[PDB]
Amino acid sequence: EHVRRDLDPNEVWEIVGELGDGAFGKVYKAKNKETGALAAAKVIETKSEEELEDYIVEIEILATCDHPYIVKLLGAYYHDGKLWIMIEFCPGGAVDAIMLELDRGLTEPQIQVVCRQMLEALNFLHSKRIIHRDLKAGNVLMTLEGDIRLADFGVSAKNLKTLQTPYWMAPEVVMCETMKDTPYDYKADIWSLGITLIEMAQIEPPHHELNPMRVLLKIAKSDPPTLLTPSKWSVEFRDFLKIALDKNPETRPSAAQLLEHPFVSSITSNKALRELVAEAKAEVME
Numbered sequence: 001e002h003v004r005r006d007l008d009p010n011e012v013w014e015i016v017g018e019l020g021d022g023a024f025g026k027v028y029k030a031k032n033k034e035t036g037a038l039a040a041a042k043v044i045e046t047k048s049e050e051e052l053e054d055y056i057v058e059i060e061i062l063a064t065c066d067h068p069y070i071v072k073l074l075g076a077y078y079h080d081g082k083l084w085i086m087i088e089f090c091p092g093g094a095v096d097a098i099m100l101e102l103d104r105g106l107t108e109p110q111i112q113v114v115c116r117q118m119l120e121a122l123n124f125l126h127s128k129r130i131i132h133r134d135l136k137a138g139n140v141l142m143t144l145e146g147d148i149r150l151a152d153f154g155v156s157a158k159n160l161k162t163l164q165t166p167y168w169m170a171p172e173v174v175m176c177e178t179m180k181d182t183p184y185d186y187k188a189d190i191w192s193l194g195i196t197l198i199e200m201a202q203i204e205p206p207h208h209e210l211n212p213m214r215v216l217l218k219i220a221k222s223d224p225p226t227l228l229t230p231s232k233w234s235v236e237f238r239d240f241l242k243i244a245l246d247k248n249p250e251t252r253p254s255a256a257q258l259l260e261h262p263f264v265s266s267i268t269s270n271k272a273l274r275e276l277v278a279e280a281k282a283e284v285m286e
């Protein structure tokens with residue numbers, strides 16, 4: 001058990017601030033009493049010991065995934081009726097919040113670094129048989145060194161609900177088993193990645209202008225999205241998008257394959273992102 005049921009968390013940890021109320025809840029800024037290190041925390045009051053299981057599964061995921069580009073789990077406590085989960089503090093904030101502060105999208109050299117780094121994360125995740133299912137610029141966090149961190153496994157953990165003859169089975173039912181089970185569902189993250197790259201270029205994902213209920217339909221019947229003004233962007237970018245955003249997941253490539261694409265195969269430094277994070281920090285000061 002990575003959740004220490006013993007040991008009250010106010011022995012080691014100490015709260016110092018808030019950060020934001022977005023959808024799921026509040027997020028505190030936390031400090032380590034011994035080492036003095038910063039962490040980002042969630043203190044959850046639990047409606048149900050049944051539901052709790054979802055957050056425990058997230059913790060298990062986080063504890064298994066040691067990779068440079070995925071947030072470190074610094075601690076996990078259940079004490080009183082509350083659940084404490086401490087994450088490596090990422091002081092550059094999320095890329096979407098970055099685009100709000102600078103009031104613009106990322107440049108192509110910036111997107112390349114993010115894309116390259118996400119591919120390495122996904123490729124790691126997919127070889128551990130984990131799917132993110134919730135990739136968007138708001139879940140890509142930045143460190144001051146200009147590296148990303150993938151952050152929220154709240155959807156991915158809910159889907160490891162799967163932890164809990166068919167001669168008469170319908171076609172569309174068959175396909176939603178092989179699609180949702182294995183070799184095929186890795187490709188969903190690949191699609192989302194493609195969409196996160198367009199969000200980064202254009203600030204808003206495709207179909208932002210549509211009401212949420214109608215997007216699902218639009219995604220189903222539409223041609224795959226492309227960049228609004230293809231003048232602005234390199235052929236390598238458009239072609240990367242072209243092949244990542246294949247509606248047919250069978251032919252859509254894996255992360256490991258896309259790491260061999262010219263758009264990211266020559267990315268040796270994270271400088272462009274180091275520069276963007278610095279511009280953001282300075283803008284926050286005003």
Ligand SMILES: COc1ccc2cc(-c3c(-c4ccncc4)nc(-c4ccc(S(C)(=O)=O)cc4C)n3C)ccc2c1
Nearest residue numbers: 020022027040041042085087089090094097138151152
């Ligand atoms: C269960 O373990 C945890 C604990 C805390 C978590 C906090 C965030 C997080 C972090 C974060 C910030 C600094 N260091 C790390 C993370 N920032 C956010 C965050 C907060 C608000 C907003 S907003 C623009 O809607 O106001 C956006 C983000 C990304 N979240 C959700 C993200 C995932 C977290 C996971």
